[PDB]
Design a protein around this nucleic acid. Structure first.
Lengths: 135, 132, 62, 99, 22, 213
RNA sequence: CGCAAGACGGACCAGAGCGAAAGCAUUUGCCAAGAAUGUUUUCAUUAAUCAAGAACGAAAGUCGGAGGUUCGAAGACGAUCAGAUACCGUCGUAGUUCCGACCAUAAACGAUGCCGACCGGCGAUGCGGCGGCGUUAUUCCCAUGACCCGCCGGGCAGCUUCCGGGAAACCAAAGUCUUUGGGUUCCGGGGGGAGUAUGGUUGCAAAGCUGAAACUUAAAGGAAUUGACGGAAGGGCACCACC
RNA sequence: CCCAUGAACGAGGAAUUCCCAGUAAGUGCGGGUCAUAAGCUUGCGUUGAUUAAGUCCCUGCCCUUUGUACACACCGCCCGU
């Protein structure tokens, strides 16, 4: 399963944390990102749509991810934190800090944290109307 | 709450202003003199006035009092305030002056003074605060 | 977390929705170089010792 | 009556200013009228700083900062309590709060 | 009523008059 | 039901010799099964490694993307694919009372590596300056951009990919640009913002092996 | 990880600039314009404002062609609601993009015509010029560039003032108005009816321009003041509030 | 004033009165009641508390700023079919 390695060296994965305002994704992949190691969302840890992006659901997802990635030997994790980006919000959802704290507390060794939310040089028209959302 | 009312405070102010000489640092003597010199119809009111009188006297013991002024002590205030340094602070044998005021004095027919010493001007004109 | 007691050194004030938490500076009697803000519950005087099995958390301040 | 000498915007000497979208509601608001905020924060919150610092595989790695540009339409600014109504005389004060 | 909607209603009446008048 | 990770094997990913640290980490891939060959599924991989994980005393806000160019003996030999600045650095340099001059060039190295190089610089407020803003005029901006393009072209077209990367690691191109533009308008934070591999010569094992030591 | 498409030019980006206005933001090149500055250049009254007439004129809309990413009137559906034909959500046509031709209207606003003269102070800022300690890039140097300190002219503005004005709000113009005349164009005459009817004219259409009356009415309206109220914000008090 | 049986209740799912030290609570007495008549009420001693030295979270009320086309003052005014 996991690769044999000295107990003093940490094999790195990359944890893409997609913190939306409707759901949170914790996605650990290969250093290249092409091979997926684990992926747990908030909606795989709760039953209420309002709680899919709660800090508690992100905490559960991050702990599940950390356990699964530890059972494959990955001990260190680079962080790619992103919001929705594009037209929509650039601020990460409520579950980003929860997932990060849970991953740190679950025995994972945090590497380099980077923000990768999609920023346009300039984008298509935003989903809202000219007057925006009025409710 | 133990905040004094403007009635007690005003009466104690008038008592200090008008009858300073008799008033002392002891509360009880203050109570007796306030009873003797003024008609205060309530013992409790007498005692409140006497307490504020005592506190005001301690305040004058600290020095100046912001809320009252007595001329009988203002004369001695001015007596103390007549302080004359032995050597005037304006009589300095060497006075540093800038070249521009040197030129002004030379144009003022005072270029032959001996106490003036020219000063090196600042090499830059960076006196304004960075805007923003 | 290591067990290390803290003694109250200054009563900062009151916080909470109903104003029940108390901000207080607490110092650990090991180096006297650390003095952290702690929110505490219940009647708190000045100069007692608060047992602390947990110290990685801080009270909101500044 | 006319409330503000600047008409509530900063458009002097030009005719048109390109609009932007409110970061909250996506309302089209002129760029020089929109209330802009530059949020400078940390990707890791203050409470979570210690756990990430002690889980780091580096020493003195320093946490990265998050850089947010928020544009608010006036209704969203007032609701979010980033600006407030001010007295007729306090309105003239363009000095930013000390922070 | 709002002046813009009053004008819109007036224009609708004008369209009806224009179409009816043969 | 059966985990697809029981038949996945782990390969060490090696960096080109221009970097001090050669072991950039561990990748993994499924084992060969008929059409699915592990070797072919490893060559399209791009590893975005911070320079501080590639060099020793270098900065950490410069990432290099290395593309796995060949695989042999559980060793994924990569090659320089591009370079970028981290989002935090780019966002930290763009401030509100200065001019940001940007340039880009499409220049080929001596060994046929067509690269798009982006350079960013910012006008610098002076030590004794009272004026709040430090804007460069349009002709000054154009001159600075021209100087940036000439310096980037000069530093790339006369060298090959090895030397180009060797001068990208310390960002000597940005230092050269900043030095050369101080007589037009003093520049503040000059960097090669991003290098993207536009086109590359057809794969040859000899140049890879010469690159890996 | 690539490929394609069509939009859009983030941050820098400002009470900054340019344009008659509408409007205008990725290098780079070409083309033709343009203000201001400088000028001991030239002409020599050639000017100002303007019926008629003309150029341009956001967005939406119209006709034909190309494209069609996103958003999205209409429409379908899902919610909310007493009902929602709305606000909210999933879609989604015309449209939104480009070309040609129409349309000529906007809170097209500084709700302030243009030209000229005069009448306070102050600090900024953009462009041009002039003068000056000093710092810096300046490699035997002057230049020049970035600053620093002033000055002049034309701009976008700001602060302050018992210039004066005004119903005041406020305005250094909205001042120099009963101490009423610098020139000139447009335009209003209580509120509605009504920018309606009708006629004319323009337009493919939508509509644009011009534009009443009968009748009706004692007010409508402006600015400011004090209350009352707010499903506005901020403070304070209360074991008839909480903890 | 006298003489067994019995309904019912295992701390009373919502919603919440009132409570700052001789306070809450624990009980008896005295008046107004009253020809006899206290579960009411008005005073009185009689025992002594883990609890609070705070806050605006709720409920209100007050103030300030703000908006108003309200002034019979939002239970206002007002639009259209």
């Amino acid at each position: 399963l996991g690769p044999q390695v000295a107990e003093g060296e940490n094999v790195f994965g990359v944890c893409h944390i997609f913190a939306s305002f409707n759901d949170t994704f914790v996605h650990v992949t290969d250093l290249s990102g092409k091979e997926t190691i684990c992926r747990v969302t908030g909606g795989m840890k709760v039953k209420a749509d309002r709680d899919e992006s709660s800090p508690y659901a992100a905490m559960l997802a991050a702990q599940d991810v950390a356990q699964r990635c530890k059972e494959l030997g990955i001990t260190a994790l680079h962080i790619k934190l992103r919001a929705t980006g594009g037209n929509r919000t650039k601020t990460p959802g409520p579950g980003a800090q929860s997932a990060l704290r849970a991953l740190a507390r679950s025995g994972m060794k945090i590497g380099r944290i980077e923000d990768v939310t999609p920023i346009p040089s300039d984008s298509t028209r935003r989903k809202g109307g000219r007057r925006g959302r009025r409710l | 709450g133990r905040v004094r009312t403007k009635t007690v405070k005003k009466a104690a102010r008038v008592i200090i202003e008008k009858y300073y000489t008799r008033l002392g640092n002891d509360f009880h003597t203050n109570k007796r003199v306030c009873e003797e010199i003024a008609i205060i119809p309530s013992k409790k009111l007498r005692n409140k006035i006497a307490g504020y009188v005592t506190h005001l006297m301690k305040r004058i013991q600290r020095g100046p009092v912001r809320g009252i002024s007595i001329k009988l002590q203002e004369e001695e205030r001015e007596r103390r305030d007549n302080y004359v340094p032995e050597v005037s602070a304006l009589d300095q044998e060497i006075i540093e002056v800038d070249p521009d005021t040197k030129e002004m004095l030379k144009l003022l027919d005072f270029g032959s003074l001996s106490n003036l010493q020219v000063t090196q001007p600042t090499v830059g004109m960076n006196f304004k605060t960075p805007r923003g | 977390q290591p067990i290390k007691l803290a003694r109250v050194t200054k009563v900062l004030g009151r916080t909470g929705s109903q104003g029940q938490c108390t901000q207080v500076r607490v110092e650990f009697m090991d180096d006297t170089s650390r003095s952290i803000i702690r929110n505490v519950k219940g009647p708190v005087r000045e100069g007692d010792v608060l047992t602390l099995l947990e110290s990685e958390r801080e009270a909101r301040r500044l | 009556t006319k409330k503000r000498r600047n008409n509530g915007r900063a458009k002097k000497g030009r005719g048109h200013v390109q609009p932007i979208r409110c970061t909250n509601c996506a309302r089209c608001v002129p760029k020089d009228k929109a209330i802009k905020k530059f949020v400078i924060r940390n990707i890791v919150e203050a409470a979570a700083v210690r756990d990430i610092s002690e889980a780091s595989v580096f020493d003195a790695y320093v946490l990265p900062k998050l850089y947010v540009k928020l544009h608010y339409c006036v209704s969203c600014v007032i609701h979010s309590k980033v600006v407030r109504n001010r007295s007729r005389e306090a309105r003239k004060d363009r000095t930013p709060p000390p922070r | 009523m709002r002046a813009k909607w009053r004008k819109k209603r007036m224009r609708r009446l004008k369209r009806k008059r224009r179409k009816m008048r043969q | 039901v059966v985990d697809p990770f029981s038949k996945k094997d782990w390969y060490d990913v090696k960096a080109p010799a221009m970097f001090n640290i050669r072991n950039i980490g561990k990748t993994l891939v499924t084992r060969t099964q008929g059409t699915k060959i592990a070797s072919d599924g490893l060559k399209g991989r791009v590893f975005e490694v911070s320079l501080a994980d590639l060099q020793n005393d270098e900065v950490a806000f410069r990432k290099f993307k290395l593309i796995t160019e060949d695989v042999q003996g559980k060793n994924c030999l990569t090659n320089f694919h591009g370079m970028d600045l981290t989002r935090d650095k780019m966002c930290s340099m763009v401030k509100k009372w200065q001019t940001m001059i940007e340039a880009h060039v499409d220049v080929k190295t001596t060994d046929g590596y067509l690269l798009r190089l982006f350079c960013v610089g910012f006008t610098k407020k002076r030590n004794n300056q009272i004026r709040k803003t430090s804007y460069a005029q349009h002709q000054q901006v154009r001159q600075i951009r021209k100087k940036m393009m000439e310096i980037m072209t000069r530093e790339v077209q006369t060298n090959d990919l090895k030397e180009v990367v060797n001068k990208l690691i310390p960002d000597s191109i940005g230092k050269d640009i900043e030095k050369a533009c101080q007589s037009i308008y003093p520049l503040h934070d000059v960097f090669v913002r991003k290098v993207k591999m536009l086109k590359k010569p057809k794969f040859e094992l000899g140049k890879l092996m010469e690159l890996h030591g």
